[PDB]
């Protein structure tokens, strides 16, 4: 009985370990990915604002 | 406790991620409509009993409790993992969209400057 | 170092130049009708002054420049940039002068809610409640702001965020010795959270608190509430919380203060207790 | 390892919040620009 | 089934009408209508014909003044052909990768490189061919500082080389990745495993130098001693010192009792033990 | 292979074309420069790609463009990162200056962190790394990003204890631990920081460490239960008797129960050496 219970406990511990490593690596990749999107969207919004401001000033200069 | 906090806050992150995806889709649709309009404008024990004694009991009982808790963790942990996977995909799906959006305005602006002269 | 003196001197010089520019703007407009180019340029100088002052660690000057820019650009009918600068003041004066940040954030909230942008207004309300809580013990204003933010979030259908606001409100109200609101909020959130896959694991905890908050009222209703909760959430029985409550009830049923204290000490030894739980247990022990 | 996972997840959450704020600003400005374009095209025509 | 016939007929009719319209400024409308017809074919689920129409529409879009649309249509055609002639999908995705690289977007190019390598290895038996694409994607990711993707590609190529019996490349990659992970505050827990794998590969060359290699790993990473892998491998080497088959069999059975050994590890163990 | 020679020749041709276009005197020249630098990057000619990027950035900044100029400056900086660390530092300093000018403090803090990283890893310099990390921490704390500021302060305190006086380490560890105790999720780790602080006090004198540990134990009751508290009490008692064997036995037993950071090993070796 000792062998069965002890090996069961060890197997459960190992399973938790492996799956936690997998999930944490996935989280790291996701973190890099979100870091990228932040700058992407910031630059997009800045450029659209700049372009539309140019549009307003040009159209008002012509009218 | 750390496990539970992780689960709840992961749920919140998923909600926020869905919200941003919806907002981005709305932005894309509005941008396309505006551009088109503008173009149209133109278990029995755990320790052997060598001497028995009270000391050998609590030990075993502790182990028992330990085992039970471990069980819970398994299910707990497994569940959490699933969530992350979904988020991964959704996160990817936004970049492309957003990227395309950005590209559009660029060319649009370029066109807005090329028709004039 | 050189940073303090140099940044201060250059910022004063630039701010004086901006003041001269705005002074001459009226004459330019009267004599030539230049439009808003002068005013926009002055606002640019003022925003730059505020940012440099922020770099120079002089938060008061940065906040004053931000407020001036907010006022000037609001005078130009640009309520969006005016609200942006009002929030700039709210976050700059936040540390230099909390009171000014309060009114700045109220102004920004009014401007935003004028357009129906409820999420930003709720975020600002939460920030203001945090400002009230961190420095002052004026709990009532924090409760009001949290209730307003929770109502806004519920009106936006964004669940799991109004929930946290309601939990904060209930926890703070329970401290004021008004238990009905705390009991109702705790039970409502617990019953909502039983059915969620991810949140299920946490649901039990809420019930515990409610029962403890139901304990001060009287013993008998606490017992019957325990029965009601257990029948609805049988897994609750497995948790140590039910065992601890049963032991405490048994100890108190015979005025056995020593057993109650020993059980509390043992439970704390296994897991450290929270200040809220410590206070609630001490209040119960008074009887 | 559990303690180690926690703060990574928290940082990801806050950073998501910042992105969400930026997105709300962008969409609001886009809607306002659309309204202005509609006004201009309708009134000039 | 009625649905397949109905969708096929509808998509055929739409493409025929699109062809008539284009045959009748006109380039943009032709491209759009061909895209609609190819989409309807995709809903009809005739993978070969749908992909052929999609690639023809992509070429016509190339005839039109646009690049991003061209690349998107190329990748869509490659995906459609994914369940068809691998050569056409490979060529279309290679052209899309070239077009993407020309704009400087190396990340999507590396992603497409990985995808084409995956289809090459899974569909065909050529592994060395997939090695080149994997290495190119790894180089692109390393140049862009995406350490995780580069590590994944390096691990895959090292495992393939180890299977191919090029133990030197496998050992170099395994050692480099293991030490890099050990340096990082995170992922350190996994580092041990890499070292262990290297030892096995190094054992293929000889047994005497395996002792020196394990001692070097031990001194470089003391924690590796407490790992069950170190105990198992030292026991296996000591048992192999004497020509007794039972000892290592019992050791591997004991280790396997806890966790099931993977196919690669089991194959490597059989290869070492049989000789 | 064809890649090297072909891309190099095309890059030289494009550079000459852009130089001729500017010789006519403009955005076309910048586009040609960017494309040539990209091809150089594909060619693996890491060096001289940052040169073309810097030239394009200067040409674009000539026409008041600042955002794309900063992006290309950062691009050239990272390109030179491996080929030439010093020019990477310079390009990143320029980008940091411009970004701070527009007030994008998060970008400036990230670039400062990268500068400190490159300074500490490739070159040998701690003071520059400490200054850059402190600047990034100040920027983030001004932006109220608590986690990043805590990380930077912890790194700075660790390095200061490693080489500099212990007062900075004492202050940073005490502050971080005090902030950490109240946090519900982070409370469990608080002990660690406090422990570290105490050890630094020991490097000065035993009595200072004793008073510091007494104050910490009073402030944090849970710290009394920590195995760390028992270990320091035993070590202090052993040191007070000039008995090195007890010191060694306690250290060995604690290491046997749990492995060592190799920082605690250094501090314990320093303390043991001065037991006399």
Numbering used by the authors:
A (entry chain G): 197 to 259
B (entry chain I): 41 to 82, 130 to 204
C (entry chain J): 0 to 286
D (entry chain H): 215 to 259
E (entry chain L): 0 to 23, 36 to 286
F (entry chain K): 0 to 24, 38 to 288
From the reporting publication:
The membrane-anchored SNARE (soluble N-ethylmaleimide-sensitive factor acceptor protein receptor) proteins provide the energy to drive membrane fusion in various cellular contexts, such as intracellular trafficking and exocytosis. Supercomplexes of NSF, α-SNAP, and either a syntaxin tetramer or one of two binary complexes of syntaxin—SNAP-25 reveal atomic details of SNARE processing and show how sequential ATP hydrolysis drives disassembly. Six NSF protomers come together to form the active form of the enzyme, a homo-hexamer.
All classes revealed substrate-bound NSF without Mg2+ needed for ATP hydrolysis and disassembly, and share the same overall architecture, with a spire composed of NSF N-domains and the ɑ-SNAP—SNARE subcomplex on top, the NSF D1 ring in the middle tier, and the NSF D2 ring forming the bottom tier. A linker N-terminal to one of the syntaxin H3 domains is found within the catalytic D1 ring of NSF (light blue). The D2 ring of NSF (purple) does not engage substrate.
